[PDB]
Ligand binder design. Structure first.
Ligand SMILES: N[C@@H](Cc1ccc(O)cc1)C(=O)NS(=O)(=O)OC[C@H]1O[C@@H](n2ccc(=O)[nH]c2=O)[C@H](O)[C@@H]1O
Ligand SMILES: N[C@@H](Cc1ccc(O)cc1)C(=O)NS(=O)(=O)OC[C@H]1O[C@@H](n2ccc(=O)[nH]c2=O)[C@H](O)[C@@H]1O
Ligand SMILES: [Cl-]
Lengths: 416, 413
């Protein structure tokens, strides 16, 4: 029972007519979909849970359709958003559509027979749809009375100053019609998404009934919350030019103990039995948990590949050990991007001024004392001379020196 | 000052930035518009007040644009309407558009130089507009918080069972864009309509500022109410003679209450305000109801219509029917007097029973013998009488009257 398997992983928030859907899944393969709007040049970790759920359905023999919102991205989803978004240009949205489509594709199998994945774009049917056709054929089936009362937009109708445009208010209809289109085009009978999408999904179920006289289903995945109550992202992009593999890997390494097993269930393809054995091992080891290391390895390999995972571990190992000889120029570029705090400095700066400019020390007088106390390392090597100037060999690849005050305060000097 | 002149006739419900509009009108001709949606094959008396208002602006030298809602008629205006309307087909709406455009055209001058009237249809811009273009270029300028607070749709936003579809809720944006579109195409700076249109007009004023950075204005005419509190023109009083005959039209006006007659001359005629006031004091039989009937009937149905209406009225009052033509009897059968269809050979007693002028043959016999019945205005007191062929006027019609005023028209099969 796929729904029950997803429920044990904590991956089912809500499901329409669960018995009928489970009966349909057990009968044979179904086609299902999940949509992703282009609001940026990359997806982030928030988008990964439903994307990986498409794969989980596919591994059970179902056919996933990954829709990218070429049209909906020109409108903007208001669902549980406190503020009206500015409209994006057609040129920017198209550039983002191509990037997202390409980023999504490796997570799904496009070559596994009948249930091979399908890439879809709702601009195909909205780009040539007349406004009177939309208002009459689609709009007549929507009650404004019900629409203004949906949880996703109700808060936006409290104050005019923090209100909602007719553009964003119409979004629900567009996503509604997409479900009817995919049902007609590919026999799609299930739509999945995060729990904020419930109302957009159910409008599609109701419209598919009205337009195509077909019974279709909805299933949502919970939005991730941490046990402490704080917000999940602290955003973590899938694109390495936005969030380096090192920072990505470190984010998972630093997962709280109360979230690590749930995150393994949400973000990995490890069996429930293995995750339960990992939790049990951590419970009776007599040591701190090792699950964070397993979670970091799994998700980093999934998103950034074996090469990305090895680069994340090599940077982590070098930063910890102090020995930087194993680092490449590309590794230092991850560090400069977002790995450790960084500063740009003109070559010839003494150690004292590097400490002040890097904000590792408030003044040169303070810098002098901390150097003399043997609290500073240069590329992991201790340097106790206050009057010290860096040697040309300490500027790695001619432009990198890593300063560390104590055991954990880093600043990468990027020489100009 | 034209606004002052309209206020004196009681034709101004509301007006935006009034000093500026009066100033714009005073410096020279403006282009203005009023829209009419196709919800039937004819306009009715309710539509006459803003229609004549376009002509009142045109006489003052302004350029009227008469818009027929070929696109808006496919959506449906919910303004102050208690219930959602069913969608009409594209084929039906197109038939109504052509009938309404042709009914409006004689009320305005399409050949008077610079200020010649223009017929417009919003299907010309909405019929091929892409949905994303509409939602982005127009929809972004509309606040749902503001829309749900418009007086015209409030009664519809309390309960789902007396609710509003997304279709009718989007209407306000189409009428809003129409004003912006007419401002760009023809330099239209004023929109008029009845008071129910206030919110649709003010949305157009706001959108024109947002889209074209132009200042435009709105003016509404009051919805006609009676002194007694009842509904005006109550079914409806249509402009189409095949729906409401010129006789029935004329009679409706003759029977206007004295408390409404002077206000109605101001709203429905081109008579000067000086003339109407002079007519008001003089009544302290009033000739006003007769003057109102004469003016509006001539305006809608022409001199030929007015003469037929007067000719039928006169023949029914006198009982002398020789002046009635075949077409006059056709007006009587349509809606002029109660009518009953009958097979030729029916006796007088049967005609009185079938027409419901008498409850039984035995009673009809007593009524006929009492000299209460006229056949085409001639007394007939033989209870056993059968109609003569010459009494079937144009081989089709016989008018019975019981007593001094109860008529029934027999239409022979
Ligand atoms: N309206 C959806 C995209 C969509 C869906 C179906 C269509 O037919 C058309 C468009 C939307 O705006 N999605 S999203 O791009 O913001 O996110 C994609 C998915 O990721 C989930 N998500 C997003 C952010 C987050 O932190 N957590 C989360 O689960 C959302 O619920 C959605 O299912
Ligand atoms: N929404 C308007 C038509 C319209 C106007 C402007 C546009 O850009 C597009 C469409 C509408 O539905 N009008 S109506 O066809 O119902 O009536 C036409 C006019 O007659 C007035 N009217 C209607 C009935 C009545 O009893 N009294 C009255 O004054 C209305 O206020 C409107 O100005
Ligand atoms: Cl006879």
């Amino acid at each position: 029972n796929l729904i029950k398997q997803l429920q044990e992983r904590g991956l089912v928030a809500q499901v329409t007519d669960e018995e009928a859907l489970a009966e349909r899944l057990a009968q044979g393969p179904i086609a299902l979909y999940c949509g992703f709007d282009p609001t940026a040049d990359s997806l982030h970790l928030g988008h990964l849970v439903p994307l990986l759920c498409l794969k989980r359905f596919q591994q059970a023999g179902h056919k996933p359709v990954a829709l990218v919102g070429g049209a909906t991205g020109l409108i903007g989803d208001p669902s549980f958003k406190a503020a009206e978004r500015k409209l994006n240009t057609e040129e920017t949205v198209q550039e983002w559509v191509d990037k997202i489509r390409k980023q999504v594709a490796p997570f799904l199998d496009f070559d596994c027979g009948e249930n091979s994945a399908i890439a879809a774009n709702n601009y195909d049917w909205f780009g040539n749809m007349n406004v009177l056709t939309f208002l009459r054929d689609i709009g007549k089936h929507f009650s404004v009375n019900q629409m203004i009362n949906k949880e996703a937009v109700k808060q936006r109708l409290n104050r005019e100053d923090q209100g909602i445009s007719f553009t964003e208010f119409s979004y629900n209809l567009l996503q509604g019609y997409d479900f009817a289109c995919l049902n007609k085009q590919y026999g799609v009978v299930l739509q999945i998404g995060g729990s904020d999408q419930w109302g957009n999904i159910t409008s599609g179920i109701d419209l598919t009934r009205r337009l195509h006289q077909n019974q279709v289903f909805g299933l949502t995945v919970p939005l991730i919350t941490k046990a402490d109550g704080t917000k999940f992202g602290k955003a973590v992009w899938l694109d390495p030019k936005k969030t380096s593999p090192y920072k990505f890997y470190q984010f998972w390494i630093n997962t709280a103990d109360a979230d690590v097993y749930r995150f393994l269930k949400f973000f990995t393809f490890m069996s429930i039995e293995e995750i339960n054995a990992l939790e049990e091992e951590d419970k009776n080891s007599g040591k701190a948990p090792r699950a964070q290391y397993v979670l970091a390895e799994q998700v980093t390999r999934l998103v950034h590949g074996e090469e990305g995972l090895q680069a994340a571990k090599r940077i982590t190992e070098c930063l910890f050990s102090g020995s930087l000889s194993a680092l490449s120029e590309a590794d230092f570029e991850q560090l400069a991007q977002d790995g450790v705090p960084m500063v740009e400095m003109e070559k010839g700066a003494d150690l004292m001024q590097a400490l002040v400019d890097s904000e590792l020390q408030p003044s040169r007088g303070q810098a002098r004392k901390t150097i003399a106390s043997n609290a500073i390392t240069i590329n992991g090597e201790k340097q106790s001379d206050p009057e010290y100037f860096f040697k040309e060999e300490e500027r790695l690849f001619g432009r990198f020196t890593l300063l560390r005050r104590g055991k954990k305060n880093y600043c990468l000097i990027c020489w100009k």
